[PDB]
Amino acid sequence: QPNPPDVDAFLDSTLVGDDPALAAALAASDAAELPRIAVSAQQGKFLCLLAGAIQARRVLEIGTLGGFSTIWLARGAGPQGRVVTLEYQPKHAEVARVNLQRAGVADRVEVVVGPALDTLPTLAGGPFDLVFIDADKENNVAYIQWAIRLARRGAVIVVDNVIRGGGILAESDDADAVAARRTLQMMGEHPGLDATAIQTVGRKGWDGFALALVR
Amino acid sequence: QPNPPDVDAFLDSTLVGDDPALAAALAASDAAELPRIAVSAQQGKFLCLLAGAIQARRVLEIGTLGGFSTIWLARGAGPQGRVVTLEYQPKHAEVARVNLQRAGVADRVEVVVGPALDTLPTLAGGPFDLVFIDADKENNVAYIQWAIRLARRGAVIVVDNVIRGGGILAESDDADAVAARRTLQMMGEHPGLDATAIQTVGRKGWDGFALALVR
């Protein structure tokens, strides 16, 4: 009987528990018709613990998607940390701001509105410790080149949804699956990166994330 | 129909490539009838990148299992890093030492032979930055308590195989599934830890790992 969504409900109850600020962010994102949140609670808390493990003080997020991922990163970056998150749609940006205010981390977060390919070149404040990429996968090759350019040596880059239910193997038909396949090929062959990819299951289905160190 | 083992062969080719030292460690472990290695190449490289990301200098591994996991950790800890790895069986310990010598990391690794509950109290190679636990699940609660005791604040603990194909949900037959369920509930209620669990698929099947920060 047991399937990965059922295991994730057990893991959420056991390791995350009641988190009204996250519940409210997911509800508000549904009401405003954002795209689906990219990370499960377990995957989001992974990003939180990764940020804490490396003592991330400056985090770049490409794809705010309602700020569920952003809340986790801002919690992990801690009282002194700062997250810069890039959102395309101003309405989506406003949803994220309210979700961040309700979670008590709006002071750690700057939401930067506009197409990421136009706003990435305009970022200052200095190099990032951690870059998280989870929207607009057609532009992943450009986002990864920008991530490398904006990140310190030894920084972590995480790219969400690089597996697409195994579509990356046999689906030339699907632009989405092709774009995920292309981001893996780019991360593997880039001499500025050392990269792995973890296939995941749970409440977000069969997918996975790439994780790289900047050399 | 793409499946996770097929996706992992593509991920291994793209992100890991030919690694004769690792191939030889897996072959020698099979010949000497060790238990199955706990981590895939992608999961092993994850441990490598995690060690590099946190700048691990002192790594504790509980369950050498032929030293596949250990080679990844020793590569990630770098030339200045030290790995202490605990193996129960002397024959298994000898396989691991040869695999470590062939991978050129023997000087970074001390294999400590005996029951982990007898050797853990004797370790002075800490405090540890990173603890990896992948053997003898029935003793996981004790291993995690020892991990916390021997680890610095902010240290990472990773516990392999905490999902068991979903067996942790209706597990009565299986000592392993029972033990995995107990390790999740212990990690979730421990005030000295913050913990998540990532469900994985790929060449090692449907399982997962817990990742915790030591508070």
Numbering used by the authors:
A (entry chain B), B (entry chain A): 6 to 220
The authors write:
Mycobacterium tuberculosis (MTB) H37Rv is predicted to encode three COMTs, i.e., Rv1220, Rv1703, and Rv0187, which share 29 to 36% amino acid sequence identity. In both ligand-free and cofactor-bound structures, Rv0187 appears to form a canonical dimer observed for all known COMT structures, consistent with the results of our SEC experiments.
The overall conformation of ligand-free and cofactor-bound forms is highly similar, with an average Cα rmsd of 0.347 Å between monomers. The buried surface areas at the dimerization interface are estimated to be 3,780 Å2 between A and B chains and 3,820 Å2 between C and D chains in the ligand-free structure. The electrostatic potential mapped on the surface of the ligand-free structure shows that the dimerization appears to be driven mostly by hydrophobic interactions, with eight residues from each monomer contributing to the formation of hydrogen bonds or salt-bridges within 3.2 Å, i.e., Pro-9, Asp-13, Gln-47, Lys-50, Asp-199, Thr-201, Ala-202, and Gln-204. In particular, the Cβ of Ala-43 is shifted towards the metal binding pocket by approximately 6.2 Å, resulting in partial blockage. Furthermore, the rearrangement of the α2-α3 loop forces Leu-70 to flip, which causes the protrusion of the side chain into the binding pocket for the methionyl moiety of SAH. Overlaid with the SAH-bound structure, this conformation of the sidechain of Asp-139 in the ligand-free structure would be too close to the amine group of SAH (approximately 1.2 Å between the δO of Asp-139 and the N of SAH) and predicted to cause a clash upon binding of SAM/SAH.
